[PDB]
Design an enzyme around this catalytic site. Sequence first.
Site, mmCIF file in Angstrom:
data_model
loop_
_atom_site.group_PDB
_atom_site.id
_atom_site.type_symbol
_atom_site.label_atom_id
_atom_site.label_comp_id
_atom_site.label_asym_id
_atom_site.label_seq_id
_atom_site.Cartn_x
_atom_site.Cartn_y
_atom_site.Cartn_z
ATOM 1 C CG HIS A 47 40.770 44.326 46.129
ATOM 2 N ND1 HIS A 47 40.850 42.970 46.333
ATOM 3 C CD2 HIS A 47 39.612 44.613 45.492
ATOM 4 C CE1 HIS A 47 39.744 42.461 45.824
ATOM 5 N NE2 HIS A 47 38.966 43.419 45.307
ATOM 6 C CG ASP A 82 39.638 47.575 43.400
ATOM 7 O OD1 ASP A 82 39.628 48.261 44.448
ATOM 8 O OD2 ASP A 82 40.376 46.579 43.257
ATOM 9 C CB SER A 150 37.885 40.374 43.704
ATOM 10 O OG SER A 150 37.186 40.115 44.913
#
Lengths: 191, 57
Positions: A47, A82, A150
């Site tokens: 992302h 991801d 993240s």
Amino acid sequence: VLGSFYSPVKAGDEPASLVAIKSGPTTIGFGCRTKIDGEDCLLTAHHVWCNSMRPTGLAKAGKQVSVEDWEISMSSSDKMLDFAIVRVPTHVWSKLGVKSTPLVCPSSKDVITCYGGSSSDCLMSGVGSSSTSEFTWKLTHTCPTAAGWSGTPLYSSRGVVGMHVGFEEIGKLNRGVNMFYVANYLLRSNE
Amino acid sequence: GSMTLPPELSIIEIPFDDVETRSYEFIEVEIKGRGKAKLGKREFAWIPESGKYWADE
């Protein structure tokens, strides 16, 4: 929770392998320097370098460099894994003073230290344990993370065992990706 | 039938070649009954969708 589950990190004393991905005045995620394609590359979440805002620069202890047209090794668009791999030049690593800390094989239960924060100058860290699931590409960790963490690597005394990508259950267990298996098993030298 | 194709071909990724190929610990993740992900040392096939050719994201 800020201050109890996390402990402030001294700027310049943070892992020389960790870097903060900045988008303008806001941070979009975290990443680290490691060898995946054979030379050297920046590992982070998918992302951050795809769905999130355009990465403008990398920040390491105040030192911030501009992100140019850097070739991307490979990045799966799956939400479970991801992850994204960017090939950054070598003259950029030294500009921030980033070292290449290799990822090793994860364990059933290892100690990990997660680092994150609003900016590279305001860093904090958490402490938890990492575990392996039945699926060699899914890791479970209790390391207390916050919003915008993240991409933070699971730093252990032996090395990096995985990378924070999300959570299994909000407030209970988080979720990390096993780059070791993706690096030498999933990733081929053709792409 | 379901058989592996020679490297002389461009690209071939069937679940069979991953059922077995890496027989130690071949990944087993299925969902919706239409999609299933599989792992291996010499294969990379995983699509939990209807097309199975990566048409979700």
